[PDB]
């Protein structure tokens, strides 16, 4: 308004100068950032002394002037000085104010209607508070603690994201007029944005603070700390008040934040799909990728794509690793040999060949690495630090707390190093059948011996006996391990050391881009294997909740419900741009041409034939009623259209529309067959399966011009077309052009025509036509 | 969205003096307060405001030709005195889905001598004893209540 | 005499349980109401009962 005119006058005055003009004319807008640093640069060494000296004065702060005049803030109440007309050297528009002035405002001053929005701004810390309040403390005890050092997360966070996925989110919720082009993360996560937008809209707020708080709300604070007991963010956030080196304040904190359940579900799904793709013989790679992209799952309220969560988590499991490898997702340098965990500290080497005779004379190749290399190893409640040297386990130290876990870790380590005579001459018990190739897929002798151990405890005992045994020398009695896993004995194993106190887990902030084979075995720029499908449980049955396996092979429904779902899908795919589609017809109010679509003609056979006319009447009625005015709900037409194909008739409609399979849908209420919500207006739930509706038009429920972006696209710039805003963008015609401003210092030309095709397929298929 | 944009959109270049109907359902109004309404709307005879986070009806301007109103899905409570002065020619009213506790809040509606039908559903008042009868004895001019007259006579379509 | 009294710390995280025969051994810990109802009868007690 008048303020706008003042801004224009100021811009004019500033351009009248020469230097300001040169700088606002030369270069791009990014220079602003640079200019933001050359100004207001001043620091202090010990702000503490300076603060005390400074606050001692009688008007130590600065403050706005007009805000005080408007706030009718006087210069005294009962004789205490509150501010004095004057000018700071830096701001030039601020006045020196007293500490007493702040107190004055809070006690009696300018009241505001409401302030509960704060609870949303700092939601993380109110969550901390609530989690604390729901704890039941317990006694306090004194003792020594085995605190192991390791990298963990201290901030419980749902839907952990990246940074590039945030810099955009902070705009569509706060600064939409200055928003950039729509990124994929937005189009995919629409309901999330809508939620974050519903709260911080039409409110008096400082927005920079909100953005900072949102960054914290989406940042898992990763720290390298000493830890004891279970590992959960709910605890690490207050570990300081649970136990130290000499004391422990017992307390139960198991039933809060429901975090690890999501991770175990994810890993179960990963295992399932990995096995599924393994069922194949030549395309398990593409099969797995398809299973991935053909799947989704629910998190709290929202539905997220699997491949998106997989690239955000950090669960180092032999399942997640494979998936993240297929999708080209980089990851850390962490190994996996069966259930155990491993990490290399130093050393090097290279592959080498050797052979062993299974029964009598049966040569079988097995490989082993060359020079000395250190490794840390982590099994359940047990740690170890060992060294391998030319097909032998040189030394090892342990700091666990259990005998069974100790023995299992030791055995798996011995295997990992091919130490012993068994790798020189396998036992009679094993045979060529147990060797490999369940159905053709070979197996290295390593995992063979692995399962041979997991089969019987006596195999493990014999394997341990393969390691040298001697008499426990004096003094080393404490640092010795028997066959049962006892901290001391009269005779103990060879080259072993024990101790109380776990080993400090190493650390490295490194990333690597690995690959995998057609047999589901990943490689890392070397012949080393980081993961496989033999190091995971064999199989198990589970009933996954709030998941969407939208793939034929990964489906249990029959042809009837599947046909209904596919008919709905096809009917939705006509929700794009261009004439002959439902949006253009709605705009033209041609409610009749919808009845003659081909998709309804393909879904008609599924309708109950003895009452198809009556239902048809009702459906057409609703459609006209919604179309003639303009007050329609897109989630009801897509539901009732399949019935408008036949001819109306007479009869009593009793509230429900039945198909030929004794499954109905009701016009207005959500059911198992067709459900949706105003929260997530971009999804349709049919028989549990989810369907993503494109964003071409926005009906009464949808919000803020974020529901038209999938209908627009970029085109060659045309200076003839007009320039408009982001709100009038809805009044354009399908197929028209218009110029527009995007983000900052950028103008482009858009056209309301979509392009459903992506680049994956086009790149993937075209690359397959070149390897011939 | 927002009642302002909704209104400006419904007004497809039409003056706010020749319309006979308006609808603003599935919108939002800051502080549950009307925004964009004036006395300019004179020929308006119908209104529909549903699920807009409304809480009070103080701001609504003077509308005489109005003869039907809908305020369901909101959380209005207490302000029914404003309806008499602003809209004295009203006949049909609906409040199902709002915060209504006692009858003292309903008493002002007696002055709407032009009132014929009222709709109270899902409110606390309905959970009382002798509520239909006591209401009828309070508002005698009224004939229909939630779609049913005395003796439970179902009302016609329209 | 029925089941004996029970002790507890402030926060109630710990709780001793004692029989009747030994309440004469911790008469100092018990609250005044129980204390004024137990001493005059200690004479008639033998091990855990009242004559």
Q: Are A607 and A659 in contact (CB under 8 A)?
A: yes
Q: What SS3 state is found at A230?
A: coil
- The closest of A257, A197, A206 to A230, measured between CA atoms, is A257
Residue A71 lies in a domain: no
* Spacing of C-alpha A601 from chain mean position: 41
Whose CA is closest to A287, among A601, A552, A495, A541?
A552
What DSSP line would sit under A59-75, residue for residue?
S-EEEESHHHHHTT--S
Q: Is the dihedral of CA A447, A448, A454, A459 positive or negative?
A: negative
Closest Cα in chain A to B25: A700
Total count of domains within chain A = 6
List the single residue in C with minimal CA-CA distance to A139.
Answer: C13
The CA angle A758-A763-A769, to the nearest 5 degrees, is: 135
Q: Any idea of the CA torsion for A754, A759, A760, A762, to the nearest 10 degrees?
A: 110
**Domain shared by A377 and A266, yes or no:** no
DSSP state of C50: B
CA geometry: angle B61, B63, B67, nearest 5 deg: 135
- Check whether residue A478 and residue A580 sit in a common domain: no
Helix, strand, coil shares of chain B as percentages rounded to 5? 20, 10, 70
Nearest-angstrom CA–CA distance, A133 and B26: 38
Chain B residues near residue A631 by CB distance under 8 angstroms: 23, 25
- Give the single-character DSSP code of A642: G
Q: Let me know if residue A514 belongs to a domain.
A: no
| Dihedral angle sign, alpha carbons of residues A390, A394, A397, A402 | positive
CB-CB: which of B23, B28, B30 is closest to A631?
B23
- Does residue A354 share a domain with residue A493? yes
Contact indicator for A447, A465 with CB cutoff of 8 Å: no
Determine whether B41 is exposed, middle or buried from the number of CB atoms within 10 Å of its CB (0-12, 13-18, 19+). Answer: buried
- Radius of gyration of the CA atoms of chain A, in A: 34
d(CA A211, CA A171): 9
Q: Is A511 helix (H, G, I), strand (E, B) or coil?
A: coil
Burial of A97: CB neighbours in 10 Å, binned 0-12, 13-18, 19+: buried
Looking at the fold, whether A472 and A588 belong to one and the same domain comes out as no
User: How far is residue B145 CA from its own chain's centroid?
Assistant: 14
Contact between A141 and A248 under an 8 Å Cβ cutoff? The reply is yes
| Residue among A700, A704, A705, A729 with most chain B CBs within 10 A, to mutate | A700
d(CA A342, CA A379): 9
- Does A139 contact C at CB distance below 8 Å? yes
Inside any domain, residue A524: no
Asked whether residue A400 is assigned to any structural domain, the reply reads yes
Question: Contact, A264 vs A320, CB < 8 A?
Answer: no
For residues A273 and A291, is the Cβ–Cβ distance under 8 A? yes
- Specify the DSSP element, H or E, that contains A13: helix A2-16
Give the burial string for A297-312 (b: 16+ CB within 10 Å, else e). beeeebbbbbbbbbee
Contacts of C14 in chain A (CB under 8 A): 139
- For residue A187, give every residue at least 6 positions away whose Cβ sits within 8 Å of its Cβ, in sequence order, or none: A695, A709, A710
C-alpha to C-alpha distance for A284 and A290, rounded to whole angstroms = 10
> A113 to chain B: which residues are within 8 Å by CB?
31
Q: How far apart are CA B158 and CA A41, in angstroms?
A: 74
**DSSP β-ladder status, B92-94 and A94-97:** unpaired
Q: Is-contact A711 A700, C-beta < 8 A?
A: no
Closest CA to A417 of A370, A469, A384: A370
Long-range contacts of A585-594 (CB under 8 A, 24+ apart): A586/A627, A586/A632, A586/A697, A587/A734, A589/A627, A589/A628, A591/A620, A591/A623, A591/A624, A591/A627, A591/A628, A594/A623, A594/A637, A594/A641, A594/A644
Which long-range contacts does A39-47 make (Cβ < 8 Å, 24+ apart)?
A40/A90
Q: Report the distance separating Cα B90 and Cα A108, nearest Å.
A: 45
Cα distances from B90 to residues A743, B50, B94, in angstroms, run 50, 18, 11
Residue A82 in domain: no
Q: Which of A114, A115, A202 to mutate to test the interface with B (most CBs of B within 10 A)?
A: A202
Chains in touch with A (≥3 Cβ pairs < 8 A): B, C
Listed residues A220, A244, A270: the one ending a domain: A220
Strands A61-64 vs A94-97: parallel, antiparallel or unpaired: antiparallel
First to last CA, chain B: 31
Q: How far apart are CA A378 and CA A400, in angstroms?
A: 9
The Cα A340–Cα A531 span in angstroms is: 12
CA angle centred on A276, ends A275 and A277, rounded to 5°: 95
Nearest to B30 among A202, A704, A727 (CB): A202
Residue A256 zone, left/alpha/beta (φ > 0; ψ -120 to 50; rest): beta
Q: Is residue A166 within a helix (H) or strand (E), and if so which, with residue range? A: helix A164-167
Alpha carbons B68 and B21: distance in angstroms, whole number: 10
Task: Please say whether the beta carbons of A575 and A696 come within 8 A.
Answer: yes
Q: Are residues A449 and A480 in the same domain?
A: yes
CB atoms within 10 A of CB A402: 14
Sequence-distant (6+) residues with CB within 8 A of A191 are A301, A302, A679, A680, A681, A682, A683
In a domain, A48, yes or no: no
> Residue A249 is inside which H or E element, if any?
strand A247-252
Positive or negative: CA dihedral A539, A542, A548, A550? positive
The span from the CA of A400 to the CA of A408, in Å, is 12
Task: Return all residues near A78 (Cβ < 8 A) that are at least 6 apart.
Answer: none
Instruction: Supply φ then ψ for residue A423, to 5 degrees.
Output: -65, -15
For residues C9-30, b (16+ Cβ closer than 10 Å) or e, as one string?
eeeeeeeeeeebeebeeeeeee
**Residues A174 and A154 both lie in one domain:** no
Dihedral angle computed from the Cα positions of residues A274, A280, A284 and A290, in that order, rounded to the nearest 10 degrees? -80
Q: Are A607 and A660 in contact (CB under 8 A)?
A: yes
List of chain A residues whose C-beta atoms are within 8 Å of the C-beta of residue C11:
137, 139
Instruction: Name the residue of chain A whose CA is nearest to C10's CA.
Output: A139
Domain assignment present for residue A763? The answer is no
Whether A613 and A706 map to the same domain: the answer is: no
Boundary (domain end) residue, out of A431, A466, A501 = A501
What residues pair up with A252 in beta bridges, in sequence order? Answer: A136
Q: Burial of A251 by CB count in 10 Å (0-12 exposed, 13-18 middle, 19+ buried)?
A: middle
* Helix A445-455 / helix A403-416 crossing angle, nearest 10 deg: 160
Closest C-alpha to A742, from A185, A186, A182: A182
CA distance A177 to A743: 8
Kindly identify which residue of chain C lies nearest to residue A141, measuring between CA atoms: C13
Taking the CA atoms of B7, B12, B13 and B17 in sequence, report the sign of the dihedral they define: negative
Contacts 24+ apart (CB under 8 A), A458-465: A459/A429, A460/A407, A460/A408, A460/A411, A462/A427, A463/A411, A463/A414, A463/A415, A463/A420, A463/A422, A464/A407, A464/A410, A464/A411, A464/A493
Technique of determination? cryo-EM
Whether residue A309 is found in the same domain as residue A204? no
CA angle A459–A461–A467, rounded 5-degree value: 110
Angle subtended by helix axes A260-278 and A318-326, to nearest 10: 70
Pair (A729, A659) in one structural domain: no
Mapped onto helix, strand or coil, the DSSP state of residue A471 is strand
Q: Are A453 and A463 in contact (CB under 8 A)?
A: yes
With respect to residue A415, please indicate whether it lies within any of the assigned structural domains.
yes
DSSP 8-state symbol, A610: G
- CB neighbours of residue A44 within 10 Å: 10
Strand bridging mode A497-498 / A393-398: parallel
Could you tell me the resolution of this structure in angstroms?
3.3
CA distance A702 to chain B (A): 8
Q: Which of A698, A689, A607, A677 is nearest to A644 (CA)?
A: A607
Query: Which of A699, A716, A746 represents a domain boundary (last residue)?
Result: A699
Ordered alpha helix ranges (H), A541-689: 559-573, 582-588, 598-603, 612-629, 634-640
Which residues face A304 on adjacent strands? A297
Chain C closest CA to A243's CA: distance in Å?
17
Cβ–Cβ under 8 Å, residues A386 and A395: yes
Check whether residue A402 and residue A453 sit in a common domain.
Answer: yes
Residues forming a β-bridge with A374: A346, A387
Q: Identify whether residues A181 and A289 lie together within a single domain.
A: no
The backbone region for A630, taken as left when phi is positive above 0, alpha when psi lies in -120 to 50, beta otherwise, is left
Strand B148-149's sheet: what is its strand order?
B92-94, B117-119, B144-145, B148-149, B153-154
Domain with A145, as residue range(s), is 134-160+221-255
In whole angstroms, what is the distance from residue B63 CA to residue A334 CA? 74
DSSP secondary structure code for residue B24 in this structure? -
Q: Are residues A292 and A403 in the same domain?
A: no
Rounded-to-integer distance, Cα A678 and Cα A682, Å: 9
Chain A contact for B20, CB < 8 A? no
């Amino acid at each position: 308004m008048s303020l706008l005119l003042t801004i224009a006058k100021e811009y004019k005055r500033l351009c009248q100068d020469a230097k300001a003009a040169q700088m606002m004319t030369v270069g791009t807008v990014s220079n602003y950032t640079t200019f933001k640093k050359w100004t207001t640069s001043r620091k202090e060494k010990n702000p503490s002394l300076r603060m005390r000296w400074a606050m001692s004065s009688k008007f130590p702060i600065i403050a706005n002037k007009r805000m005080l005049e408007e706030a009718q803030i006087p210069k005294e109440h009962n004789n205490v000085a509150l501010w004095e007309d004057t000018e700071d050297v830096s701001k030039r528009d601020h006045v020196l104010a007293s500490a007493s002035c702040i107190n004055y405002w809070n006690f009696c001053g300018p009241c505001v209607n409401n302030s509960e929005v704060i609870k949303e701004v700092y939601k993380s810390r109110f969550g901390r508070l609530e989690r604390r309040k729901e704890i039941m403390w317990k006694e306090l005890r004194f003792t020594l603690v085995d605190r192991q050092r390791r990298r963990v997360d201290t901030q419980p966070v749902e839907q952990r994201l990246r940074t590039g996925e945030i810099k955009d989110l902070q705009m569509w919720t706060l600064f939409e007029d200055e928003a950039p082009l729509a990124s994929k993360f937005i189009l995919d996560n629409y309901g999330l944005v809508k939620e974050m937008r519903s709260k911080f809209a039409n409110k008096p707020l400082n927005k920079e603070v909100v953005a900072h708080m949102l960054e914290k709300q989406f940042n898992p604070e990763s720290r390298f700390l000493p830890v004891f007991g279970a590992i959960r963010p709910e605890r690490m956030e207050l570990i300081h008040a649970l136990g130290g080196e000499t004391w422990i304040q017992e307390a139960n904190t198991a039933g809060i934040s429901n975090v690890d359940q999501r991770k175990n579900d994810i890993r179960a799904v990963c295992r399932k799909v990995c096995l599924a793709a393994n069922a194949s013989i030549m395309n398990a790679k593409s099969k797995l990728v398809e299973y991935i992209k053909s799947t989704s799952m629910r998190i709290g309220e929202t539905e997220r794509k699997l491949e998106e969560l997989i690239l955000e988590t950090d669960d180092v499991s032999p399942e997640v690793t494979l998936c993240k490898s297929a999708l080209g997702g980089q990851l850390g340098k962490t190994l996996s040999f069966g259930p155990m965990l491993l990490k290399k500290i130093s050393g090097s080497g290279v592959k080498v060949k050797d052979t062993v005779y299974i029964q009598g004379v049966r040569a079988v190749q097995f490989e082993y690495w060359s020079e000395q290399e250190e490794f840390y190893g982590e099994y359940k409640s047990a740690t170890a630090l060992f060294s391998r040297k030319e097909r032998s386990l040189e030394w090892i130290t342990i700091g666990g707390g259990i005998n069974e876990d100790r023995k299992r870790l030791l055995a798996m380590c011995m295997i990992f190093c091919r130490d012993g005579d068994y790798f020189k001459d396998a036992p009679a018990t094993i045979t060529m059948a147990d060797l490999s190739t369940k159905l053709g897929r070979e197996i290295p002798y390593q995992y063979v011996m692995m399962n041979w151990i997991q089969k019987s405890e006596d195999n493990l005992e014999a394997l341990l006996y393969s390691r040298g045994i001697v008499e426990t020398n004096p003094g080393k009695m404490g640092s010795s391990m028997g066959i049962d896993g006892s901290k001391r004995a009269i005779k103990s194993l060879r080259a072993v050391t024990i101790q109380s106190g776990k080993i400090d887990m190493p650390e490295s902030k490194e990333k690597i881009h690995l690959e995998l084979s057609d047999n589901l075995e990943a490689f890392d720029s070397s012949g080393r294997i980081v993961a496989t499908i033999l190091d995971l449980p064999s199989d198990k049955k589970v009933t996954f909740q709030d998941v969407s396996f939208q793939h034929p092979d990964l489906a249990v429904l029959r042809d009837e419900k599947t046909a209904i779902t596919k008919g709905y899908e096809a009917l939705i795919k006509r929700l794009g741009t261009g004439d002959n589609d439902i949006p253009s017809l709605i705009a033209k109010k041609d409610y009749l041409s919808l009845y003659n679509l081909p998709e309804v003609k393909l879904m008609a056979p599924l309708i109950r034939p003895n009452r198809k006319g009556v239902y048809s009447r009702v459906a057409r009625k609703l459609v006209s009623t919604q179309v003639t005015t303009g007050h329609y709900s897109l989630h009801e037409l897509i539901k009732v259209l399949p019935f408008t194909y036949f001819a109306p008739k007479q009869g009593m409609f009793e509230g429900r529309l039945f198909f030929s399979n004794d499954s109905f849908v009701e016009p207005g209420v959500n059911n198992n067959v067709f459900s949706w919500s105003k929260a997530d207006s971009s999804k349709i739930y049919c028989h549990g399966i989810a369907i993503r509706v494109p964003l071409v038009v926005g009906d009464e429920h949808m919000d803020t011009s974020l529901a038209l972006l999938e209908g627009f696209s970029v085109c060659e710039n045309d200076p003839r077309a007009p320039m408009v805003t982001r709100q009038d963008l809805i009044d354009v015609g399908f197929g028209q052009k218009v110029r527009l401003f995007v983000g900052q210092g950028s103008v482009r030309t858009f056209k309301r025509t979509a392009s459903q095709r992506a680049a994956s397929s086009d790149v993937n298929k075209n690359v397959k036509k070149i390897k011939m | 969205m927002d009642m302002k944009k909704r209104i400006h959109l419904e007004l497809r270049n039409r003056t706010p003096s020749d319309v006979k109907e308006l609808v603003l359902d599935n919108c939002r109004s800051y502080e549950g307060k009307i925004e964009g309404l004036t006395d300019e709307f004179e020929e308006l005879e119908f209104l529909s405001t549903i699920n807009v986070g409304l809480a009070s009806v103080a701001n609504l301007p003077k509308l005489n030709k109005l003869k039907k109103l809908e305020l369901s899905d909101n959380r209005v409570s207490g302000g029914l005195e404003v309806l008499a002065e602003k809209c004295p020619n009203l006949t049909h009213l609906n409040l199902s889905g709002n915060k209504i506790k006692d009858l003292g809040t309903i008493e002002p509606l007696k002055k709407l001598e032009n009132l014929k039908s009222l709709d109270l559903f899902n409110c606390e008042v309905t959970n009382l004893n002798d509520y239909r009868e006591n209401v009828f004895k309070l508002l005698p001019q009224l004939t229909y209540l939630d779609g049913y007259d005395r003796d439970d006579k179902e009302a016609p379509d329209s | 005499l029925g089941q004996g009294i029970r002790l507890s710390n402030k926060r109630k995280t710990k709780e001793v349980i004692i029989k009747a025969e030994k309440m004469g051994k911790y008469k100092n810990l018990m609250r005044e109401e129980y204390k004024n109802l137990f001493e005059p009868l200690e004479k008639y007690i033998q091990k855990d009962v009242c004559f």
